[PDB]
Design a protein around this nucleic acid. Structure first.
Ligand code: DTP
Ligand code: CA
Ligand code: CA
Ligand code: CA
Length: 341
DNA sequence: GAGCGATACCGTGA
DNA sequence: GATCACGGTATCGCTC
């Protein structure tokens, strides 16, 4: 098949540049400001000016301020970015019926029945870049190959404001030459683990024994790497359904008493139901971060949808089951809702 | 032995 | 004891 992947470049920061173009050319750091100390939280996305001096997603805000104290630090306006993204997504819908909206900044197009070769696909990509830039002033990066993974790899390599093809010859080279840590889905935990056997390339997952791999990284990820290494990865471009909506919050002081926790928990439910909008969940989970920072979760699934009032009652029962079963104190508390109608 | 959904930890940034 | 959101996924209980 022929797959076309489009990533929005440094998306949260870019949208802020578009909404305030003065920021263009200066370093921009969109952060989540979270907890107790002022400037606590983490960096969500940096533009390239900021990534040049070390500021990147996931580092603490105060450490970014040590590196670039004069950069523009903005809070996350996730509702804004989602509205922009939903508009770009509707732009991309006019290029095939087979669209997988993978995340707020990414989507996969199956364009097999709309073009016959990579040269036509490529040309379609520039048209998609041009259209998104023209109508929304957002640069994207396109990646094109025989399946979702290598199409995304093509994007990873061409970013930012780029476009790249990976043909079947390149696929074979990359199966031999690319670093597994750079395979999509393979994060740092799993990547490090693959230094057990210093598995550094896809083809290496064929030397090792299947049960060994399985026992280190899990069956799902093992099957995944094998099928790639074998170049018999096919995964249809499907329309995705949201799996989970929720909200966690950080409390001013560690607590263990229901009545001080209840207010944060109810805020989290309120904010969660706001984002749910028309979606009715049948499952709920109370999630709590402990004073030592382990996460602990208890849920219940219902045969029906969960009204807000039931969420309120059940969430308390679930928080109570948390406080009996674990003796530690609680630092953060939230809910997550799942199993939509 | 194995299907099926729930569960709660786990890992990625989809 | 300094991150949130989502959803991945190994396992478990129930069951035939
Ligand atoms: N450690 C983290 N903590 C919080 N948010 C994170 C973290 N890592 C990633 N994110 C979120 C915010 C980023 O905007 C979003 C995209 O992840 P990332 O892989 O950094 O971007 P990307 O592949 O889309 O690259 P680029 O931003 O250059 O387009 O994921
Ligand atoms: Ca991006
Ligand atoms: Ca992305
Ligand atoms: Ca990434």
């Amino acid at each position: 098949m022929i797959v076309l992947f489009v990533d929005f470049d440094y998306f949260y920061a870019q949208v802020e540049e578009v909404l305030n173009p003065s920021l263009k050319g200066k370093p921009v750091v969109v952060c989540v400001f979270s907890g107790r100390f002022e400037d606590s939280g983490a960096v969500a996305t940096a533009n390239y000016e900021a990534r040049k001096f070390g500021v990147k997603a996931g580092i603490p805000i105060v450490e970014a301020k040590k590196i670039l104290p004069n950069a523009v630090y903005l809070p996350m306006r996730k509702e804004v970015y989602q509205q922009v993204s939903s508009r770009i997504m509707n732009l991309l819908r006019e290029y095939s019926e087979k669209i997988e909206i993978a995340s707020i900044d990414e989507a996969y197009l199956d364009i097999s029945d709309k073009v016959r070769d990579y040269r036509e696909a490529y040309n379609l990509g520039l048209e998609i870049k041009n259209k998104i830039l023209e109508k929304e002033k957002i640069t994207v990066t396109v990646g094109i190959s025989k399946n979702k993974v290598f199409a995304k790899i093509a994007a990873d390599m061409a970013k930012p404001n780029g476009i790249k093809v990976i043909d079947d010859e390149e696929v074979k080279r990359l199966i031999r030459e690319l670093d597994i840590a750079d395979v999509p889905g393979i994060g740092n935990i799993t990547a490090e683990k693959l230094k057990k056997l210093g598995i550094n390339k896809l083809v290496d997952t064929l030397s090792i024994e299947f049960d060994k791999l399985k026992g280190m990284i899990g069956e799902a990820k093992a099957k995944y790497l094998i099928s790639l290494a074998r170049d018999e990865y096919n995964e249809p471009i499907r329309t995705r359904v949201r799996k989970s909506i929720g909200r966690i919050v950080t409390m001013k002081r560690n607590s263990r008493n229901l009545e001080e926790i209840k207010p944060y928990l109810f805020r989290a439910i309120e904010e969660s139901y706001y984002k749910l909008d028309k979606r009715i969940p049948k499952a709920i989970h109370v999630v709590a971060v402990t004073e030592d920072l382990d996460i602990v979760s208890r849920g219940r699934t219902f045969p029906h949808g969960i009204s807000k009032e039931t969420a309120y009652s059940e969430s308390v029962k679930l928080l109570q089951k948390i406080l009996e079963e674990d003796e530690r104190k609680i630092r953060r508390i939230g809910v997550r809702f799942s199993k939509f109608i």
